[PDB]
Amino acid sequence: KQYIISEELISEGKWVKLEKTTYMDPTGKTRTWESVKRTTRKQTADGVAVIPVLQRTLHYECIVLVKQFRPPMGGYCIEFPAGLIDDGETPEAAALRELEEETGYKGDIAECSPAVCMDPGLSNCTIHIVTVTINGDDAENARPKPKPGDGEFVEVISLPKNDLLQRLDALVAEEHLTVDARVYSYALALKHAN
């Protein structure tokens, strides 16, 4: 019933563009929206985010997160490891690679979402969420080696899965960090389950 009629470029940077989208509303009235897109998409999605479940015997299961300065936020954020998918790369492969580069952990794929939207009122940006388990007792994950790309500066923060939401709240309260909405949503549901 609703659909895109046209898109007008407003401004294109190296990484991001802003468009004016014209669309037909379900009454048959014509309407405009300001839309953001990445200039990098080729892929099933722009990016992957990895939910990394660190499993060590005789320990709580942990969710492995990352902390990094985010220029658009003007501050540090706590997030799932994540990055853009390389042209020709599979989401699964992008997940294991990003996870290794950002955390040093080598992990196994458990499940992979369809493409899901990041902020559909604002952008067309999509990701695959990839659940990965990490056998923390294997020698390759003993002293995990983070291999950052150029200009990446990532701190790793592992938090117990069964207390994730209280732990994140603590970090916000004391460290003045910004938690990612997908992280926070996952944490909420761990508490809301049953």
Ligand X SMILES: CCn1cc(CNC(=O)c2cccnc2)cn1
Q: Which residues are annotated as a binding site for substrate?
A: 15, 33-34, 38, 70, 84, 119
26 binds ligand X (CB under 6 A): no
CA-to-CA dists, residue 65 to 26, 89, 90, 104, angstroms: 42, 23, 22, 12
The binding site for Mg(2+) comprises 82, 98, 102, 152
* Size of interface with its own copies, in residues (CB under 8 A): 76
Exposed/middle/buried for residue 128 (C-beta within 10 Å: 0-12, 13-18, 19+):
buried
Q: Which does 83 bind (CB under 5 to 8 A by kind): Mg ion, Cl ion, ligand X, none?
A: Mg ion
Residue pair 64/51 in contact by the 8 Å Cβ criterion: no
Q: Taking CB under 6 A as the rule, which mask of x and - marks residues 30-49 in contact with ligand X?
A: ---xx---------------
58: left (phi over 0), alpha (psi -120 to 50) or beta: left
User: Does 192 sit near Cl ion (CB under 5 A)?
Assistant: yes
Q: Can you list the pairs that 164-169 forms with residues at least 24 positions away whose Cβ atoms lie under 8 Å?
A: 164/63, 164/190, 165/190, 165/191, 168/78
Tell whether residue 83 is a contact of Mg ion (CB under 5 A).
yes
Min dist CB 132 to Cl ion, Å, is 9
| Gaps in the chain after residue (C–N beyond 2.5 Å) | 42
By CB under 8 A, residue 53 contacts its own copies: yes
Find residue 8's DSSP bridge partners: 20
Candidate list 15, 88, 142, 174; residue touching its own copies; CB under 8 A: 15
Stretch that binds its own copies, among 63-71, 86-94, 101-109, 135-143 (CB under 8 A): 63-71
Going residue by residue from 120 to 159, which x/- string records binding to Cl ion, judged by CB under 5 A? ----------------------------------------
Separation CA 35–CA 177 (nearest Å): 28
Give the residue closest to ligand X by C-beta.
Answer: 151
Q: Which chain residues interact with Mg ion by CB under 5 A? A: 82-83, 98, 101
